[PDB]
Amino acid sequence: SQIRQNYSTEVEAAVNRLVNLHLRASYTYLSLGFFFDRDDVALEGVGHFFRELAEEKREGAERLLEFQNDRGGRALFQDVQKPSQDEWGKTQEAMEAALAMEKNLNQALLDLHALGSARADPHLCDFLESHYLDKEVKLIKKMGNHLTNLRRVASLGEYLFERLTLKHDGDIES
Amino acid sequence: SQIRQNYSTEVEAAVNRLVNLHLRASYTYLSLGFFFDRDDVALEGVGHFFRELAEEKREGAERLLEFQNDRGGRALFQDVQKPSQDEWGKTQEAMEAALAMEKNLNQALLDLHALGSARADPHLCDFLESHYLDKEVKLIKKMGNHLTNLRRVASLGEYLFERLTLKHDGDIES
Amino acid sequence: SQIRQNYSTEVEAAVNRLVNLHLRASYTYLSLGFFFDRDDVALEGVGHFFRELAEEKREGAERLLEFQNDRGGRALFQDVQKPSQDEWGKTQEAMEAALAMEKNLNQALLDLHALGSARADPHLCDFLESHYLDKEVKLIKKMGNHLTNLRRVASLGEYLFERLTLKHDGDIES
Amino acid sequence: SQIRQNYSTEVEAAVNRLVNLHLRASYTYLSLGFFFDRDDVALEGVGHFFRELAEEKREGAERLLEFQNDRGGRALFQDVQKPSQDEWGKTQEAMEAALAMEKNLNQALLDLHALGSARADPHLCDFLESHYLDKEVKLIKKMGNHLTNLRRVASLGEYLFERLTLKHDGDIES
Amino acid sequence: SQIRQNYSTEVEAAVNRLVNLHLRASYTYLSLGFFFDRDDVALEGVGHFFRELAEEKREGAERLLEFQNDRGGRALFQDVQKPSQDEWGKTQEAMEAALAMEKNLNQALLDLHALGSARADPHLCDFLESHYLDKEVKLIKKMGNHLTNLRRVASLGEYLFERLTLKHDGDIES
Amino acid sequence: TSQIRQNYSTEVEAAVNRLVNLHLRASYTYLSLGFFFDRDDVALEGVGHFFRELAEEKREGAERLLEFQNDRGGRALFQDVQKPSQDEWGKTQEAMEAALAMEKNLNQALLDLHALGSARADPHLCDFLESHYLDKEVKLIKKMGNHLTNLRRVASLGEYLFERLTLKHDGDIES
Amino acid sequence: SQIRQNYSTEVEAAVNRLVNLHLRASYTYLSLGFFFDRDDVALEGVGHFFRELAEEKREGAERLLEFQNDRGGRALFQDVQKPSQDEWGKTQEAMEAALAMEKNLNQALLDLHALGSARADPHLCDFLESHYLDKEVKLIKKMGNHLTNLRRVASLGEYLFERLTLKHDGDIES
């Protein structure tokens, strides 16, 4: 690693378990994503929402892996834990189960900035800030808004929420 | 000054407190619009509605200052009072609080016309007519229609109203 | 709130008073902006300059509120006090008054970034040093350059400056 | 009528009978217009002229009803009195009967403005001035000019007039 | 009436009172449609629906006059009765008031075709069959479908019906 | 007595007639003021074009009063248009001052006519004056006042720069 | 039903058996059509001809059902009778069988128009006249012409006819 410079091994190991955090997160989003496409639920909108969330997480993890080899470090891959559940009931707990993941995923992330801000790594204070932290802050507010809307309609409102909110904006957001 | 002509100080001072009336009005509208973007409410439709009404008011006040210096008058700026409240409960009171703002605002305009119409100022008597009073009538009617609809659905109706009326007519009333 | 996480109240109170700082700042430039389009001054260029600056400040204040309700906090609105003065004399003092009003704004921003760097808020570091602190440094240099040019021409030069510098740039800059 | 404001009933009752004045006016022009496309007359130009005038009056009456519900008023519909005649003879008296219908219509409008101008309704001032009163003054002059031309040619000239004046500008005003 | 041929006065008088049937029908439809754009109701969709039905009727009538003078007859105009009611409660009775008023219109048309078919007028067969009876049948079916849907949702259903059926199909049919 | 005449008195019909001629004298002084600056001894093309276009704005104003007239049934007559106020206008600073003096007098006659009609209750006069004339006059007085405030500040080198950098620049793009 | 008007059951029952006549008619036609693209016959032209005729008949039957539910009546579906044959030999008999099946269809339609014209239903007169009876007359003449041509060539001519008449026009008579 002739390129390695100002990259502590105490932080190098953190992004590795952070990588796998994003991997596990996308893994549970994918499972959440397909549970809602099942016939027993038949909510196309929420399924697409969570599968797109898994896309985002899987692209984030692959970004921490190129940030790694960019910063000279060598990364390893612990196994990816199965999702924290197997059937997610209705959408209202599923979003809270999901919002619980982001706050955790945003929590484990702020630690990495706090870690590097202590070890005085500015490139990390730029890369996290730029890519990850703003996206995480914007993502919690999205699931927060969706939860506030779900509680309002709460299962007729559970049906209308998918059509009038998740499917509409989901088609026009991306 | 040199251009000043048929512009009395008895009316010149009125538009000054009318200027600040619009400034205060947009100030309550801005705070109303951001209150509805909070996670606790999460009503994007009403939020955008009020946040774009605040800009109509701010452009109204800035029109009164373009009218002022046109008539040679000199306008001073009293401070802008904080809004009426700080958190506005649910949209049905917020639209009621808002419709209460217009009728008060439309009242000051009728007052200013009656002032100049008695004091024989034509330029005002048919610049207000043109730029302000018709807009105010249309705005009161729009907010009244929204209130009548809100009471009908009245909180599932609160969510459906946003989705199926405010967001739609906001996208197509850009 | 649900979304609120790693967002203090010691800083939540600061962005609230920074919101109102920006609000007053626009209120300063607005009045400064219209004074210069008055007949007694008749400087179209400086008037447009300061009105566009008020546009910028108002768009900034509205950016701290969409950062606030996003970061979880609940923001309140103290009243916006009237500008500093009421008749700004010559453009050389008004730009000096403005540059004086501007630097104080950059000072509050530096204070807020220091507060966040102490309380270890990285998302605030990103958001500020991206959207606000860079725009501020460029703004002081612009008013600084204008002041250096005004001193040079210093009222024929006051006429030419607005004519050959403010108006030309104002058309082509935006 | 939560929107109702500065809208009297002494005037609200007038716009209601003005609505029916316009309705009967179109009913006058409709029957006057089909009489002229009858075989016994066979004047296509005058028929189209009066049918378009009936269309204009119907669009006017529908404008006083959209002005009504704008001002919160409630409008009731008295029956529409049949036209003042049944066999209009020839174009020279028919234009005279028509010009008699306009001056009466313009008279009711002047009365309605004088009413609101007394009761100090500026929105009605604006609305009448803008839409109705300028259209009326200009419409009387059109029928006035047509009558002056009809007298000149006065039935060969009656054939040419409709052929060479009404039909030409009719397509030009189409 | 040199053109008159196979046109009896026993049927000529029928289309005359059939004209006024359409005129009254549009007159009831017009008032029904403006009542629904009032603030107390604030149903834009049903208002537009009935206001466009009024114009469909008003163009139906103006066709009976274009059919009349074509077939040689001379048509007179009795006065147009004010509508049935003056305020129409809510949507469900207003559509029933309409469908009940609509069926009567189709009833008079069947009477006129029976009259002409007994009196052996084939041009009336063609004209009615093509231009009128098919339209009245389609209109009765549309009003019936709307009534069934209204009863299904029957006032949240009254709001949702407007938004999700009347406004949509009115914009896309037009 | 005309068929179309309605709610149009002679106390106003005579006013718009002398108002017509006011605009005619106004274009006349503006025309002569405009060509004076085209002369070699002044050679200010910017101010010349400014005033020559002001003259056409006034002339189009006067023809609005005449077609407002015959629209409102009245019959209008034409008193002669007396020569402009002056014959040589010296410097632009007096010429703009003489001009701003012509507007305020002209805006005054309009306010007078509308006060006359508003008392006699002619709403069509409201609609026509307030719309086509009074707003234009307010903005014209403001434009000439701005030009005057600029002229005094830059005050004959500044008399030259004002024409190039202000009158001619916008004169091209504001027209 | 609510919409039902001037629609008797003595005729409502007829269109129901006419629906099934068309259904069996198409069922006859498609079976006649696939027999002709069999290997033992190998006449693609006649096969396409009869399959397109089955398309037409099926579109007709669906037009009597959209006429039915439109006239308020309720329609039931008797079972569709197997075609009148299973192996149609040569094209000359199959066209004769078809023209025999066709004329019977026109006969039922003439019966239905006679029924309605006696029972004085003008809407059925219009609907049948317009859509069905004119298409039926043109269809017999087409199969009549084809039969006359088949007799002329009558199996070389059976090959050429399909090749030179049915296929050529069939492509350009899509």
Ligand SMILES: [Fe+3]
């Ligand atoms: Fe006006």
Ligand SMILES: [Fe+3]
């Ligand atoms: Fe940083």
Ligand SMILES: [Fe+3]
């Ligand atoms: Fe027939």
Ligand SMILES: [Fe+3]
């Ligand atoms: Fe007025």
